[PDB]
Each structure stands twice: as C-alpha cells, then as structure tokens.
C-alpha cells in the first residue's frame with residue numbers, strides 16, 4: 001500500500017547513477033514501489049495525478065527514492081499529448097485526411113518528483129520507428145495503450161525523431177523575387193548540395209519577371225496558390241491519361257497550361273499559337289474548347305511531363321513559403337493554402353517565413369496552426385526566430401522560420417548569429433524560447449555590427465531623376481561587405497547559368513530612387529545634411545512638453561514654386577509631434593530597423609545621408625543583402641516593393657546551409673542550433 005517495496009537500495013550506484021540529491025534528497029533509492037495492489041518497477045509507463053480537473057500526466061519512471069524528509073517519492077520523465085505542447089487547442093485541426101491521433105505522444109526529457117500516492121495506474125506506452133510496414137505499425141498500434149514516434153522538446157517547439165554532385169528540387173511559393181529561394185540555393189552549395197528552384201509561384205507579374213530573369217531555368221508561375229494547386233491536381237490526372245500504360249483559325253501548337261485566374265471559368269486552359277500569328281496574338285482556351293486533337297494535348301503533356309514543367313508529389317525535395325496572411329479565419333487562407341499544397345506534394349523538407357506576429361496575434365493561432373498541421377502529417381518540425389542583422393545586415397529584422405523535415409530525413413537546425421548585433425527578444429510568451437542567439441557564451445563574432453556606411457559606401461552619386469537601370473560603379477568596392485556584395489554568380493555560386501558567366505557582369509543595376517514630385521523634391525532640398533535631419537529643420541519650428549511641432553510665429557509659411565507649402569500639415573500632426581521620420585535623413589553609422597516595401601520620405605527617415613534623394617532601390621537591395629547582380633524589373637515603386645517584402649538573403653542563405661547538411665545527413669543530433677564554418 002502506501003509505500004516502497006524493498007530490496008537493496010542498490011548499495012550505491014545510486015549516486016553514480018543520479019547524484020543530484022546526494023549533494024530532491026535521497027536517504028536511498030528503490031527499483032520497485034508498491035501502490036495499492038500493484039508494484040511499479042523502473043521504465044514502467046504510468047498515469048500520474050495532475051491538479052484537480054487537469055489531465056493525468058504520463059511518465060516513464062526514472063527515480064524511486066527515499067528522500068530525506070522521510071517521504072517516499074518517485075520521479076518520472078514526462079510524456080506529451082499534442083494538446084500539452086505549444087500547440088494546445090490546435091489538435092482540433094485537420095489537413096486533408098490528416099488528424100491528430102488521440103493516443104499518440106511525444107517524449108520530453110522533463111521530469112518532476114511526486115509522492116507515490118499519485119500513481120493512478122500504469123500504462124503501456126509502445127515505441128514506434130519510421131521504418132516499418134503495413135501492420136508492423138498496425139500491429140503495434142492496434143496492440144497498445146499509446147505510442148510515441150518522436151520527442152517534443154520545448155526549446156524550439158521541436159518535434160523530432162527519437163530512438164528509444166547532388167541535386168534536390170525546390171518549390172518557392174509566394175516567391176516574390178525569390179530572395180529566400182536564391183539564398184537557400186546559395187547555402188545549399190556550401191553544404192555541397194545542388195538545390196534548384198525548379199518552380200516558383202507568385203501572382204505579381206513583376207516579382208515573377210525579376211525572379212525568372214535571375215533564374216532563367218526555373219518554371220515561374222504567375223498566378224494564385226489556389227489556382228496553382230487546382231491546376232496541380234488536374235495535371236496529375238492528365239499524366240495518368242497520356243503518359244504510358246493507358247491510364248478559319250487553326251491552332252498550331254500549345255505553349256502553356258493553367259487554371260484560369262482572370263480567365264476565371266475555373267477550368268484548365270491552354271495557351272494557343274496559331275498559324276500566321278505571333279506570340280502576341282496568342283490566347284487561353286478552355287480544354288474542352290479544344291477539339292479531339294490528341295497530338296496537340298497528348299504531345300503537350302507527354303513532353304511537359306518529361307520536362308517536369310510541373311511538380312508531382314514524388315518530385316519536390318524542399319519547399320519554402322512566405323504566405324502573407326496579412327492581418328479564427330479572415331483571409332489568411334493563404335497560410336492555410338500553403339499547408340494544403342504541402343499536404344499534396346509531401347516535400348522532404350518544408351520551410352516557412354513569416355512576420356513575428358504570427359505568434360503574437362492571438363497567441364500564435366496561425367503559428368500553432370502551421371506547427372500543428374506540420375506534425376499532423378507526421379513531419380519533423382521546429383521553429384525559431386531569426387534576426388537579419390545577426391547575419392551581417394545593417395538592420396534588425398526579426399522573423400519566424402518553420403522547419404518541416406520528413407520522418408525519413410534529418411531535421412535542419414538553425415544557424416547561430418554571425419554578427420554582434422544586440423538582440424533583445426520581443427520574445428512573446430508561448431514562443432519565448434524559440435529564438436536563435438547566444439545566451440551568454442562569449443561566442444566571439446566581433447563581426448562589428450554592420451552600419452549603413454559599410455553597406456552603401458561605394459555608390460556613384462545620383463540624383464532624384466535617374467532613369468537608367470544599368471549604370472557603372474566607376475569605383476572599387478571599399479569595405480569587406482561591399483567587396484562581398486558584388487561578386488560573380490560564379491563566386492557566390494548562383495550557378496543558375498550553365499557554368500558560363502551571367503548577364504550584367506560587373507554592371508550596376510537598379511540604382512535609382514523613386515522620383516519625388518517637385519514639391520517633395522524641394523522639401524528634401526532644404527533638409528539639412530546634419531546627422532539628425534528632420535523637417536524640424538525648416539522654416540517654422542517648435543518646442544514644448546511634446547517637442548510638438550507648432551509653427552513659430554513671426555515667420556509665415558512659405559511657397560514651393562507650386563505654392564504648396566514646405567511643411568504639409570500632416571507632418572506636424574504625427575505622434576502629435578515626435579522628432580519623427582518625416583523628411584528625415586540617415587547617417588552612415590545609422591541602421592534601419594527594417595527595410596520597408598515602400599520608400600517615400602513622408603514618414604520614414606528614408607532619404608540618403610548626403611545625396612538629397614531617397615535611398616535608391618539598389619541601396620535597399622544591399623540593405624536587404626541582395627547580391628548586386630540581382631536584376632529587378634517593373635515600375636520603380638513595384639521593385640521597391642519586390643525588395644521590401646523579401647526575406648533577407650544572408651539569413652535565408654544560412655538556412656540553405658544548415659538544410660544542405662541535413663539533406664545529405666551530416667550533423668549532430670538534438671541540437672537546436674548550428675554554427676557556420678567559414679562566413680556561411
């Protein structure tokens with residue numbers, strides 16, 4: 001009843017075995033205990049009593065001991081239900097046919113000590129293993145109270161396997177210009193893996209064209225994730241049909257396929273080229289519209305399949321996504337779709353970038369939804385948050401990355417910071433322990449934090465109107481960074497081209513700011529060149545409790561040539577008056593917390609330190625860690641955006657490396673984070 005069975009107390013290997021007491025205190029230990037009718041040995045799985053109304057704990061018994069105080073205790077290490085994880089309440093999720101097994105568990109190494117009184121019963125918890133066959137599993141499972149395939153550690157919300165050259169394809173969704181995608185592909189080389197973005201999906205024409213130009217041999221789809229998927233399913237159907245074992249105007253050839261977005265009759269349409277008509281006369285026609293013509297379709301598909309113009313589940317070996325889910329469910333269906341596509345394609349890995357708020361919004365509804373969906377599919381997962389700066393950028397940009405590695409594959413870690421930028425985690429609650437940093441190990445990365453001067457310093461002077469994509473540097477890269485930022489695709493291994501040089505060798509691209517309508521231009525004209533330039537330096541001025549800007553009587557307004565004033569009324573209103581960023585300029589020793597999609601000086605302190613103009617697109621690209629050889633297209637504003645949205649290339653490029661290691665399975669275990677060997 002109430003107490004310990006008895007037997008040696010094991011002389012002492014007790015201290016040898018577990019001397020945390022022997023300094024929890026132990027008179028001695030036992031290998032068996034008797035509660036009610038029954039005796040529990042060590043290594044027995046058991047149900048334990050939580051607080052009233054709480055679910056019973058589960059445990060593996062580790063310690064049975066006669067602690068001083070004279071009490072009889074046992075310490076078991078804990079077992080985990082998905083609803084006890086970070087993901088509580090999101091067990092209610094289903095993606096496709098995937099649902100959370102109600103009896104399944106994840107094995108922490110987390111232990112606590114209790115009196116034997118709290119032992120309800122003892123449970124059979126069986127351990128699985130990925131490699132098995134129909135019924136090897138089905139047996140076990142059908143014979144057992146519970147099972148565990150993986151350990152859940154809370155450090156990174158990591159669910160991973162527990163025991164008890166080379167090419168991989170990539171799918172970039174919400175690709176934009178492909179900052180993440182490229183960077184990843186660059187790290188892959190360091191790992192020594194050849195990761196190719198065989199597909200990219202984004203619905204913006206311009207982001208798409210940037211991308212394609214910079215990775216010509218990739219299939220760039222400009223459409224929506226929805227359309228893409230549906231298109232994806234139907235295509236599978238076709239491959240079934242045409243591939244092998246049977247499963248007035250004249251259309252000449254079929255150059256394309258889609259599930260029409262604007263074309264929007266929700267049906268497969270095919271691009272049409274017809275005799276006498278240039279590519280400009282082509283049109284999209286519904287599949288049924290097409291006549292019996294096999295040769296056109298049969299050939300189109302067969303030859304497409306050969307070229308893997310489109311993914312099948314078997315072939316995608318990584319996939320990343322940026323799904324915006326701007327903002328239960330309101331829109332955000334975008335994040336949901338991401339997981340729908342993943343669910344379909346079963347990539348060997350998954351990576352997801354998102355703003356930190358995923359975790360803040362309602363207690364990471366979104367974040368826990370992504371995580372939950374991941375695990376529901378039996379996918380090794382973990383997620384942690386990284387700062388762009390730590391990887392050598394003149395900015396502090398914190399975002400969240402979700403690693404989805406398969407059961408059959410290693411789970412990539414996260415790389416530790418390469419720079420000394422000081423990170424004070426907005427480190428929400430549930431996710432407070434998901435972050436990448438050095439706790440207080442003097443990792444030495446003098447890696448003098450980058451500052452603006454270092455980033456844009458070698459920069460031919462340019463003014464408010466510069467309509468030239470490609471100018472010349474007419475200067476040598478003057479800092480370690482800058483010297484690094486302009487490097488041949490060959491030296492950075494962009495590799496997209498065939499071992500031949502890329503276009504735009506040694507050129508300078510997209511160096512040009514947006515044009516301020518003259519009113520604004522003039523306003524920037526009068527901005528001073530001092531360190532702290534703000535509109536405050538301008539005719540009319542203020543002081544007060546607020547620092548609030550109130551016009552300075554005695555001096556009346558002004559007129560631009562147009563007669564508009566210099567100081568718009570809005571500028572005065574901000575924050576009710578803060579030094580603010582209105583028409584503000586930055587120094588070389590300044591950092592941007594984050595590069596923003598939209599550069600207009602009105603509120604953002606975006607104007608070049610010495611030049612009278614807004615930080616040029618390229619200046620932001622460098623700021624975002626873009627190689628100087630990455631070309632951007634479309635209206636200046638549009639590519640300004642393309643850059644704003646992008647995930648920093650150095651960060652993504654470290655990711656690419658850790659991953660790379662993983663795909664080829666070289667790395668330690670159970671360590672949330674890596675450290676990079678050269679400058680990686």
Ligand SMILES: Nc1ncnc2c1ncn2[C@@H]1O[C@H](CSCC[C@H](N)C(=O)O)[C@@H](O)[C@H]1O
Pocket residue numbers: 174175176177178179180181201202203204207223224225226321322323324334353645646647
């Ligand atoms: N409904 C949708 N369908 C397809 N793409 C969408 C979409 N809604 C948003 N997007 C994509 O979301 C992207 C913004 S985030 C893209 C950042 C990207 N990882 C990079 O830095 O390269 C946009 O490029 C847009 O193409």
